[PDB]
């Protein structure tokens, strides 16, 4: 194990100041890996896209690795899961796109979906209200992050007819 995952660095219990704007570069490295991981084949759905699988290397390389009726649901144990991985059961590409959108919503912000209300309940209202992150000082004036924020907004749409895709999410980010 190189360093541990993103919440092993960002959420490392309210400590470890992250970086400047390479968290977007970590996220696009994750997407660059995942696109030939699961779309350069005929069809693969990643089944497990959550921040406890996105690990980090020495140069902060987010190389993803190591990933039927089941009653105890476990796939997407928090808000990583999709609104139609509530009613369907079939793992489509919208589920991996939606979990990628919520980990991007994490990496611009730095808040998980726990309850003392979740990330969707506060992201789509608080919109310019792009003053959402308060840990960093250089988070605001980069202003490609408003484009990435609207990308997360268009990525966290509920319906599966106007989706993004893991290939064309690199275009709006770079």
């Amino acid at each position: 194990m190189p360093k541990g995952s993103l919440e092993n660095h960002l959420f490392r219990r309210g400590a470890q100041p992250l970086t400047w704007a390479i968290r977007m570069k970590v996220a696009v490295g994750a997407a660059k890996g995942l696109t030939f991981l699961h779309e350069a084949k005929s069809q693969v759905i990643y089944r497990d896209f959550k921040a406890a699988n996105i690990l980090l290397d020495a140069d902060f390389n987010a190389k993803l690795s190591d990933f039927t009726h089941v009653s105890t649901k476990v796939i997407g144990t928090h808000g990583y899961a999709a609104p139609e991985y509530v009613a369907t059961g079939r793992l489509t590409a919208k589920s991996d796109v939606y979990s990628f959108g919520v980990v991007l919503l994490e990496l611009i912000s730095g808040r998980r979906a726990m309850d003392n209300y979740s990330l969707v309940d506060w992201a789509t209202p608080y919109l310019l209200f792009r003053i959402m992150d308060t840990k960093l000082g250089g988070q605001y004036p980069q202003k490609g992050a408003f484009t990435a924020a609207n990308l997360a907004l268009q990525c966290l749409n509920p319906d599966a007819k106007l989706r993004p895709k893991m290939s064309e999410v690199l275009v709006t980010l770079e």
């Binding site: 928090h78 139609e84 509530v86 059961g89 309850d115 209300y117």
Partner: protein
């Protein structure tokens, strides 16, 4: 044989869980013999089988002069997991303690020389309600649909309200709700239940469990089972009654449909006159399509995403019993 030490073990932890639940002040349970219950179930493999589930298989059976429903438990699916074996005895003693309502599928005994307590119940004359309706080879009318509506609702609010501690079972499917000759909804198998302690109605669910489609997305997303957890999973349990359509539903292309996905967009679009299980359009439904519209607006209002706006099961029971006023 080793059926005796099977009895000595399961009676031990049965009595333990029963007196831990309700102080040993039980209901008239009565035991049976394998020569009785095996001839009842016809050795577990017949057409007197009713319906599968994960832990258990509902059968029909017949002891002398009287048929019954029987519930087994799949030993091969339980015997290695300790949360399952501590869950199943909560299931049977919670149904035993719960039989004091005339709307739960009341208990007649439990037979314990097995490895796991294959337990009898009374005999509702129809079969299990499947994810459409009556499973005996035949449709069921409209008045019994609303009747089994409020007779699911008051039973599940007996689950929520009736005790010092409140208990949830977090999957009210329409697969569970059985059905007798007098057309009442003897709800069964209180079998995926957590017992959360007193005062507070909000506990962190240690696993997260039960019947995809019927998850209550807030319990999906936050991993804590709560006072509102069944309010979603009853609501589409109402809607499976109304549309007659399963929760894992396809239309020609790989099951991208729950009923809650259909209805809340079909309301402003279709004006609600397509959600009423159209094979029950040979019913006349003269003025009682208004109570159909009322109960489906009720169902979507108790299935929404801000759980503070949801009614609680006492209010859903009061409202869907007061929409009886068409009579």
């Amino acid at each position: 044989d080793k059926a005796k030490r099977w009895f000595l073990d399961n009676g031990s932890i049965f009595l333990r869980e029963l007196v831990a639940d309700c102080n040993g002040k039980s209901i008239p349970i009565r035991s049976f013999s394998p020569e009785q219950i095996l001839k009842a179930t016809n050795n577990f493999d017949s057409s007197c089988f009713v319906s599968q589930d994960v832990y258990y298989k509902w059968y029909r059976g017949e002891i002398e002069d009287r048929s019954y429903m029987i519930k087994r438990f799949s030993e091969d699916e339980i015997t290695g997991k300790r949360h399952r074996v501590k869950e199943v005895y909560n299931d049977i003693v919670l149904s035993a303690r719960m039989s004091n309502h005339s709307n739960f599928l009341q208990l007649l005994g439990c037979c314990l020389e097995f490895p796991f307590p294959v337990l009898v119940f009374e005999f509702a004359e129809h079969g299990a309600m499947n994810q459409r309706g009556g499973v005996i080879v035949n449709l069921l009318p409209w008045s019994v649909r609303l009747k089994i509506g409020k007779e699911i609702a008051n039973a599940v609010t007996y689950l929520h309200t009736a005790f010092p501690k409140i208990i949830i079972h977090r999957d009210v499917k329409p697969m569970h709700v059985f059905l007798d000759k007098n057309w009442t909804a003897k709800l069964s198998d209180l079998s995926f239940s957590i017992s959360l302690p007193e005062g507070k109605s909000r506990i962190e669910a240690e696993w997260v469990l039960g019947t995809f489609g019927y998850i209550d997305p807030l319990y999906h997303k936050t991993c804590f089972v709560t006072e509102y957890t069944d309010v979603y999973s009853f609501g589409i349990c109402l809607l499976v009654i109304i549309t007659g359509k399963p929760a894992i539903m396809t239309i020609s292309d790989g099951d991208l449909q729950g009923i809650l996905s259909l209805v809340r967009e079909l309301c402003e679009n279709g004006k609600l006159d397509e959600v009423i299980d159209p094979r029950l359009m040979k019913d006349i439904t003269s003025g009682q399509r208004l109570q159909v519209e009322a109960c489906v607006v009720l169902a979507l209002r108790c299935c929404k995403e801000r759980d503070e706006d949801r009614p609680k099961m006492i209010q859903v029971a009061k409202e869907l019993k007061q929409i009886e006023a068409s009579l």
